[PDB]
Design a protein around this nucleic acid. Structure first.
Ligand SMILES: [Mg+2]
Ligand SMILES: [Mg+2]
Ligand SMILES: [Mg+2]
Ligand SMILES: [Mg+2]
Ligand SMILES: [Mg+2]
Ligand SMILES: [Mg+2]
Ligand SMILES: [Mg+2]
Ligand SMILES: [Mg+2]
Ligand SMILES: [Mg+2]
Ligand SMILES: [Mg+2]
Ligand SMILES: [Mg+2]
Ligand SMILES: [Mg+2]
Ligand SMILES: [Mg+2]
Ligand SMILES: [Mg+2]
Ligand SMILES: [Mg+2]
Length: 47
RNA sequence: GGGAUGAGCUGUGGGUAGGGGUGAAAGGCCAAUCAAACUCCGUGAUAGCUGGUUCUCCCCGAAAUGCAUUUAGGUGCAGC
């Protein structure tokens, strides 16, 4: 009863990763690090 | 300082338009930009390049080597 009693099952919802938001998380390169192709583009799988 | 009756100077009106014009020829000039004007559109062109990418704490923690490469400052697989 009482919609303020419904909650999701544990582990079903996790927070997304926000990737360009300071040093305490994926810092400034947002997990890329590099300076080459992969810093700005994707490499085709066939390559 | 040169020309200053001449292949002179100048007013008004007109014509030639972009791979086109015009040039007593310098790649010169075509509205302060010309080895191909300007504006809008394709268009948020592309850039293996340069720059930037924003709150927190806990655990772990590298690599700068091999092979291949229109390859060597890029990338694929291996290694970590
Ligand atoms: Mg910073
Ligand atoms: Mg990453
Ligand atoms: Mg890289
Ligand atoms: Mg580097
Ligand atoms: Mg950087
Ligand atoms: Mg594709
Ligand atoms: Mg004389
Ligand atoms: Mg004289
Ligand atoms: Mg006219
Ligand atoms: Mg042109
Ligand atoms: Mg010359
Ligand atoms: Mg001019
Ligand atoms: Mg051209
Ligand atoms: Mg298009
Ligand atoms: Mg440690």
């Amino acid at each position: 009863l009482k919609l303020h009693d419904l909650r999701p099952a544990r582990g079903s919802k996790i927070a997304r990763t926000r990737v360009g938001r300071g040093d305490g998380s994926k810092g400034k390169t947002a997990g890329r690090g590099t300076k080459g192709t992969r810093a700005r583009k994707q490499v085709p799988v066939t390559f």
